[model samples]
Target: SSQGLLGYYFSDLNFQAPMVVTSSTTGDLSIPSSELENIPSENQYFQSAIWSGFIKVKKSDEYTFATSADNHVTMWVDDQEVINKASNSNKIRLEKGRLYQIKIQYQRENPTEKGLDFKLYWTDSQNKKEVISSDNLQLPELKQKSSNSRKKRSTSAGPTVPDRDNDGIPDSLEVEGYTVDVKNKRTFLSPWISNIHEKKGLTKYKSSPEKWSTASDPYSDFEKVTGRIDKNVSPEARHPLVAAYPIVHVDMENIILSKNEDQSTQNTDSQTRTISKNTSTSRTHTSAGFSNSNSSTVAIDHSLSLAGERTWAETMGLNTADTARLNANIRYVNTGTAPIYNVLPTTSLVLGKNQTLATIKAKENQLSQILAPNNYYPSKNLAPIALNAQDDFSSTPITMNYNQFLELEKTMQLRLDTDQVYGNIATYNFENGRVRVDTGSNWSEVLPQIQETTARIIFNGKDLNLVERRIAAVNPSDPLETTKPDMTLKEALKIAFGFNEPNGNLQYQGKDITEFDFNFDQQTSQNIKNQLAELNATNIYTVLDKIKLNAKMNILIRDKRFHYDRNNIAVGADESVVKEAHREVINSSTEGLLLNIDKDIRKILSGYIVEIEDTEGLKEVINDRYDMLNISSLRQDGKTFIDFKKYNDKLPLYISNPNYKVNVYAVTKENTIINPSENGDTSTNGIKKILIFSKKGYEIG
Candidate 1:
């Protein structure tokens, strides 16, 4: 029997727990966390003992020592070996207090049936003989003391580094910068290939006067990155190189357990937990408060203009305004709440806590605290301390000592977005409305939280604005909110009976420009968005520039004088013309009032006449009376359109007084009724009638 840490020790050697093995006493045996601490125990117990150190005899004596059991058992009191033969004994004369180097080893057999006990017994000069007591055997100080010191130095300097992906960099260091190149470049969702160098990048050490200078390639050894490396390459050769020391990703699906337990019951030490062998409490969805930004430098990779120190203003310079506009557009193109996969920045095993923690029940089987690696890693330091993943494929309470969680190399596929990862093109089209028309892009990302929008555009080397968001009105004395921009028509078309070549080679419903009469004023409280959609649905309005989204912050800064959207269009001019157009149309009417309809409703009511009061100054009616109820909801009202003729046969409410002017709005295109119950006045001086309509007149182009 081999004395090596084998089952042969069971019932063979009377060596017990704390004496030979400490792990088995704790229930299960696969704990690697404590092995690094020189506990004299091991994972390879089956390949047992070869203990070597100095030994000292308690008193000078002529000693008789005998080894019992296995034929392979051997002992050395001095530098020489004494092979222990069964049924044999050795006698040696030695000075007791002199510390001598000693070694003990047991040769193991490969299935050669044998014994395992290496028990020792000694008879001293005093003549008492029994099993050799550990009390008298001691190791030398200076020699093994130096031995332990060297072993610790080797351990801390990195004995078995983690490189599961064999990428040279430890898996522990992989975390946040997954989208950036190893050099921390790009909003790219994957690692950047080799050197990522575009024309320039900017703004590191300063707040403003953000100057753009020629940028350098962070990875000087591009070929090293370009080629696939053998497993033996150094981190410098195999990893992405940059100025930063710590890296950003690690194995995430391996999940660093974050537990939510009662603070009064649980105590944690500086990101370290003094774990006990038996702990059943589990609340794993506990979110941590650490951010992996690491407070690292963010190098803004793109810049437009305002290029020089000698900046010029408009009027004196030839179009500095457009250049300034271009700068604003480029800088903010990435601002806004992007279309994200995970709206909340939380790391959870499942979407909700009820997912699996609920699977645990009271009193029976068990909830073991899955073991974690006791060693500290150089990167992905989400927690101060965490565990080595068991991957037992069984549910267990996971936890971490740090305030953050995990992520890693070639990102774990389990965290990928559901629809994006599981299907092909159509699913993406359904989810992203992904751009068409010869895109060179393809779906390669296996992540969920990083869903990207590929749609973008630029004008003259600068990012372009997409939609113009404006808060349409504010109250001087206050009319109701109409969310229409404070805009009026600057662009109008009198598409009466015969206006040929409205757009060159134009045809309506494939007919040769047939007769139709509709006036379009770009200045209404109606959304120009709907009208443009009307065109796109008919191919009459197709501007590629209108397809993007507005920058998030720009959209929010509405109605203020300093509100800037770098659209390069003169909004001040648009506001003046549209208001006057409505003013003129209202004043010229039979009564001082104005009316409008959605295109569909306009088609229906075109033949029918809406009689205004038989009085003058409908403009005065609008100016003095307040019945602007425009932001009414549009959908269900459109459903009422077909039944509108029925409702018209019986007016629901009588006109309150003859002095009131009627103000109406209609989403007539998908025609809906302007329910009369809306915009009612509680006072005798208030206008009695109000109607609802939808949309406005703003530019998407």
Candidate 2:
């Protein structure tokens, strides 16, 4: 078979314990492959067996190595201890392309106990759990040597190398007062402890400073190194300038005018003129001018009604004979008979505070006529003979005209009081009564103005305080820490240098050693100093300084993209014989099972079937997956011993009983302790079987 195995057998069940070897032999067993059978002879009991060989793996992957064995058992692969069944099952991760040294040892003692089994299962590349078979295992002769061996020369009595200082460093780089263990291999540096000695000064061991001291204050060293390096590195490299604020121009299309009508009225009041005649109640009062009017009649006591009459007479052309031929003989004229009369007895005008003297004077043209008494008469054509009786019409001077009176009124009071002016926003000018007010400005201009101002501040770095203050004002609710001063120029620059270096985090060496453990050399220091010569000598720095000030902080924040844990062995009880093989399933599927068990009478009952007869219409049930091995139904007949491994290979067969229990007991290696009512084997030979499984399936014979 491709799966080769060799078993060294002994007649005595205790193996070499008592050196009771009545006989000894070896065979080309179906091992390394999955083969289950007795070692010596099927008729013999109390026999001890050992299977040793190499297992070849084909690929590299994370392998789940598992084993289930009865009695004492131990295994090794590639010289590494993989499994030890003295207590519990074992799991191991193995590599491929290598021939592994696999060994299994099992022993049986008392004749009363009579079961033995050993199995190995593993997860393949396909993610299936199967037992290892002969397909991957080989005989000792076919085993190949591993390539992981070290080479050496045979040198005898070589001269001893010397370390005069015993500081772990050779006598070189002369004139160093003390040795520093930057590698930190001697101790862990007490990662949990904090002290001034650790934070500020060179390190000293708590127990032995001169002999086992670690690195000095790595944080302080980092800061100094980063600071110096930053001085050399370009500022632009550290803090790239953010894009500048953009300039903005007003877009005419975006400019929108208020739909309001009365622009002369301020926001506080809608009234703009004293005599506002708003005929359309539907139209708003917010116009560009004062107000609209219907009609006006400013007349004195010359019967203003008669003035209307004259106005109508003129419209009719009664004063012109050519056009008034129908009425020219009867129309009134400047004769002593009939005359146009100013019938308006009296009229009063009221002005509000916003009504300026000039505004009043402007109304004079319409009202000045009514300010004086006057009359006029048109000609009666027949009067040519009585033309001598006509009389000229005139009015005597009275109170000053509207314009003159308005001037006097303004001289008495230059302008309306500010409180009297509508909304206190309008300016009154007696000369023309010009007034103006406003509500707000358009953002079309304001927004751009703000942008220009901000851009100037950022580019010129002028009045930084002003910008900072404004920024603070804009987001007043933000946390105070957010407004705290930015990192100093030096600090920020240092951080940039520290983080940008080829091995900035000091992770260049390995996980065991970090930047803090890196010992700076003369060349390193010189290189850093040379870089500083490229930049202007200034003290400005930023927050980067704080970040590089502490080695611990750097380590805490360093990029840790990888980590793993490796420990997987569950120990079991070994106080008693039965407890030694404490049942433990290291790896199992819902269908198949792998369990560590004892090699005794209780273990032999694993395959005993309990069949039921029809009682009160109860029917007998059978399951193909699992054997109904009810210990109570087990017969003491030795030949009836069970191979639980079969039941485990196909599990989950339900039992019909609602309340059922199995009585368990452990006996000696032979069946002597539990003398069966029926006959059984008494050879005192131990049982040993090698079981394996894989994609090709399993074979248990």
For this target, which candidate reaches the highest lDDT against the unseen true structure? Answer: 2
Q: What's the TM-score of every candidate structure?
A: 0.19, 0.17
Which 10-residue window in model 2 sums to the lowest lDDT?
464-473
- Candidate 2 lDDT by residue in tens digits, 1-701: 21243343333554431111110012222122111121222323434555554566677666655655533555556556555655433445556766565555555554343323345666665677776765565433211111232111111112111212222111221112211222211111111123422343332211111211011101111112112111222222211111011111100010000112224435644432111111100001110111111111111111112212222224322222221110001111110001111221111122233333221111211322211101111222222211111342332111223333333222211221111011111111111112222122121222232222111111101110001000101112334212212322222222222223234332222321121111112432343234344343232121223321111111111112111111000111123423334244333322333344432323222222222223244433221112122212223332222233333334442334423221122222121121112244322122211122111112211
C-alpha-based local distance difference test score of model 1 = 0.24
Clashes of 1: 49
Sliding window of 10 residues with minimal summed lDDT for model 1: 206-215
Q: How high is the CA lDDT of each candidate model?
A: 0.24, 0.25
Q: Which stretches of candidate 1 lie over 4 Å from their true place?
A: 1-51, 56-62, 84-89, 93-99, 105-115, 133-701
| Top TM-score hit | 1
- Tens digits of per-residue lDDT, candidate 1, 396-432, equal 3432222112211011112111111111111111011
